[PDB]
Amino acid sequence: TVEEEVIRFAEELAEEIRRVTGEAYREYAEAVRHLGEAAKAVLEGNSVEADLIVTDVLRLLERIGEEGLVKLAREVHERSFELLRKGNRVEALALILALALAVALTAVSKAFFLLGQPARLIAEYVGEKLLELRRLLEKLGVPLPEVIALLLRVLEVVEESLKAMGMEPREINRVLAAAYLTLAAELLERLGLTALAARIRRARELLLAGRVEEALHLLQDAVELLHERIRELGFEAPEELLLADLLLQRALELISSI
Amino acid sequence: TVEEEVIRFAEELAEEIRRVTGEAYREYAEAVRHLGEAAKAVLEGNSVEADLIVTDVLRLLERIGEEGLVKLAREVHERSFELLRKGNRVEALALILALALAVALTAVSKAFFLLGQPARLIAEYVGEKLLELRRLLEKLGVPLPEVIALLLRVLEVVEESLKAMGMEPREINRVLAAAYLTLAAELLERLGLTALAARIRRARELLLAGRVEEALHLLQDAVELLHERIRELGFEAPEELLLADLLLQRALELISSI
Amino acid sequence: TVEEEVIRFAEELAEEIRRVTGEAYREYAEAVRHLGEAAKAVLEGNSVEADLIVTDVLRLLERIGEEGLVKLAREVHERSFELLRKGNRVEALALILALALAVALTAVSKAFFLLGQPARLIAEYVGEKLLELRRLLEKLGVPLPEVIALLLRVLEVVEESLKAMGMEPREINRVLAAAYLTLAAELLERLGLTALAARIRRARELLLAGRVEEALHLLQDAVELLHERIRELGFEAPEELLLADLLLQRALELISSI
Amino acid sequence: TVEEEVIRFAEELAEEIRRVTGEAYREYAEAVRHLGEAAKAVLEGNSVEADLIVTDVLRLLERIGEEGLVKLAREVHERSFELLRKGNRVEALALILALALAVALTAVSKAFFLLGQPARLIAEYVGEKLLELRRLLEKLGVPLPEVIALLLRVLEVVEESLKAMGMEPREINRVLAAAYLTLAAELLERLGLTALAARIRRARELLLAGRVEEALHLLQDAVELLHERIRELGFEAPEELLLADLLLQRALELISSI
């Protein structure tokens, strides 16, 4: 039904915030439910109530005090207003869902860092949530490059929040690299390159266990073989290969900077 | 089977710690599983393996650094050794389960306070866990006064941990009063005095909402009615009435000191 | 028709603000009319426009600069959103009306204190407005304990505003005690205890005239006789007696602290 | 029989510490014999005696004062407890054997450095002991990647001990590179690439004789040829080649840092 998937995504995201944290972070759950209501409103035709709800969420996040989240909220407000005036329902829905996921991941990461959890669980949870959002957006109809751009925007927001809170840079780089690696592994696996995806997952697992250099070399070998495949295909290479290559290069940079 | 209830209690307690916190507090889950293994060893006949496991748990708790919980662990060690040598299996099992519950509640309260949770959720969770332990101990066969003494021992451990962590006294008093109120309400309801139990629950709910004086007066009126019933019954008053009266007096003093 | 009563209540409240003050306090009248529009919107089925209007009122009160009023507005926003999502129309209406009455009483009390009016007329006006709100809520269907909790929240907001403005504590205690006394007198009279209600009104009148100790003793005698009646009834005492007893105890505390 | 190999390994390891050192390092032999007793207990079915013995070994190593060894002991304790509860006998046995080898190698390396021995004999002894452990684990049934991870854990413990004791970094890098080189040479030889293994051994021998740059270039040429073979095979490359490549890269980094 696709729409029911969006409403269930919003409700399940709010319930996941409640399960992970409880009532210590309730403004985030309120904002996520508001964004779900806005996404529901978009799907029937009402385009002004969506703008009003997005402005309400912007006020809530401004009261919360997360600079990157507020910036993303302003950008979503402007782009969603313009697209809804023009008639691009799908991209406005994608922006609303990306904002909701960004708020949820910010709350979850803040709770995990305050508790004192290691970077492994944060990395797996962020990767799983990004995978769920990617599947939802692909079911909706958003083109893949825009989906990847939205996911990178969400990851940028999460990284900014973690850096501002006080986390040491190495752990932030580790979790961002793990998220990029799982995204790239999913992208490669979708195209049928199961062994390459398995190698990427092995590299991610070795990275999360403290074995940095071994994961670095595994990733470099995977990158070289991906380049061989891409340049053998020619100019008919599906966008999955190029997006996975870019994500792997970002992961290489982040892992090297560790 | 009663025993299966004991091992399931230990495993479910560990799983609840994992659900509430995750992997940020893993030594507590290790200690709870060790105490569950000790309780399983006691029920089979082996009395020295239980002592060795309790000593291992004591070492783990000494490494953790929770002074009151270590004190409780030492007392459990001594009493369990003496009772198992004599042959009091049930009381040793009760002490082991009380220690496990104390560790679990200490971990949960520490996580909740670190997050920034309100006192309401802590109060309800502590009350529910104490109720589960009380039902298990009553099913085992421990006499009621000893069960209650163990419950206030666990509550004293939790209070000491909360004071040492840095919580303001008023919230600690509020959660202690809520725990005593729910314990007394269950004790009264077991005897059939459902209206008095309902009044006690109303007093607890008004206390948790910040309405201190109204809850104080409701508790005082309930105390006078309980005294009237107790002095009408005479010397044939079941132990439930006396234990509930003592718990209500402690809750009254705690609420007054708020 | 009940609904027409709500709309007329909002309009009459705004007109009463205008009559008492004029155009010196116009933001309060604007907020009251906005809340009346929200209450009208709730009653047809639209639950998002109500949230948007409540957020608008929150912004208006944040610009006004009344800390307690803003806190009550935030709490009303959250609870009304949750209840309207679940489907509790009546409690959302009650919260909106309580917020409107709180704004109106804050404006009226500020005007009366700025003019230099004595506490007697302030107390009578506050009591009359609380009585009107109580009758409206009882006609709507809100359970009595929740109505009393809402009225106490409104009184807390008014007390906080008066304390922050600069009023001497004795007059604030006097007006709060008078409001509690008239509420308790109405509650007792509804149950048929006309003579007890008359004694409570006599105590309130002696309190407002400066005769503090005589009113204190009259109230203590009324409290003792109410306790006699309550403990003679047993556990079948209607909620009116218990709520009146709690209100009388709060009045006793406030009068003693004078 | 496989098990008899385990007890003989423990006893022969303890006898080897006695032969190399004598009675100057007796706590290490005590710990190794305790770990052998734990390994014997695991293979018989008793899973709590193993935990008690591992805790005893942890106390012994805490008294000794080797921080890395204590850390490895704690990790082995936790992982072995969890796996034995689940039912993974083989991995718990592997962890116990890895801890025993780590203690033995730490004692031997400390004695060798205190005497003033050159790095060559230390490197050969460490390589031989790691080879024996690898053969034992492969006979048991542990998968190769986990065996290699355990071997680098042991090597990390030894390296940390050497750094903390006072050895100059260059000799530590030399011995670690030699150990990695012999491990990779054995891994390559197992697959039939005997000439590549011979070249790796030649590089190790040139490294141990002070000829650093020649060994560096020989290793680089071997790495390029191994990469050629790996990329010629494709995705059907046995895990031996990938693990050898990772080990060779770590050895290359260590040699370059010399």
Ligand SMILES: [Zn+2]
């Ligand atoms: Zn707008």
Ligand SMILES: [Zn+2]
């Ligand atoms: Zn390679």
Ligand SMILES: [Zn+2]
């Ligand atoms: Zn003992």
Ligand SMILES: [Zn+2]
């Ligand atoms: Zn009373």
Ligand SMILES: [Zn+2]
């Ligand atoms: Zn809202």
Ligand SMILES: [Zn+2]
């Ligand atoms: Zn009198």
Ligand SMILES: [Zn+2]
């Ligand atoms: Zn243990």
Ligand SMILES: [Zn+2]
């Ligand atoms: Zn060459």
